Amino acid sequence: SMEQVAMELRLTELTRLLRSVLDQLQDKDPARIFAQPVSLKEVPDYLDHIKHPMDFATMRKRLEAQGYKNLHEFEEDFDLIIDNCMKYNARDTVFYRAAVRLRDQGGVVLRQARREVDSIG
Numbered sequence: 001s002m003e004q005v006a007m008e009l010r011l012t013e014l015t016r017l018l019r020s021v022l023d024q025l026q027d028k029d030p031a032r033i034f035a036q037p038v039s040l041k042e043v044p045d046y047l048d049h050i051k052h053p054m055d056f057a058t059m060r061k062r063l064e065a066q067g068y069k070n071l072h073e074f075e076e077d078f079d080l081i082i083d084n085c086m087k088y089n090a091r092d093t094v095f096y097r098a099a100v101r102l103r104d105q106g107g108v109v110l111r112q113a114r115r116e117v118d119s120i121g
Contacts, residue, residue: 028105054080
């Protein structure tokens with residue numbers, strides 16, 4: 001149908017906007033602490049601590065399969081990156097501190113993306 005196609009164009013455009021959002025967020029992580037999944041070879045107990053691991057490469061795979069229906073879904077995954085790190089790592093660590101900075105800096109970007117998603121529909 002023509003409606004399914006119009007729907008598919010909106011999803012494609014959301015995917016476009018979310019890609020740019022993801023690039024901006026990932027720039028706030030120049031150390032690449034959140035680039036890739038936590039290694040289960042190097043942290044064998046990680047899944048005893050963290051039930052839903054997340055990272056920027058896993059979000060990117062979802063993004064490119066057009067797997068985010070809306071900004072809320074995308075934000076949930078970003079928040080997992082931050083929140084998992086802040087539980088697993090202690091306050092006085094470079095990892096926890098990196099998550100705090102990413103959260104604080106990502107807020108600005110996410111604040112405008114919400115306005116753009118509402119605005120362009």
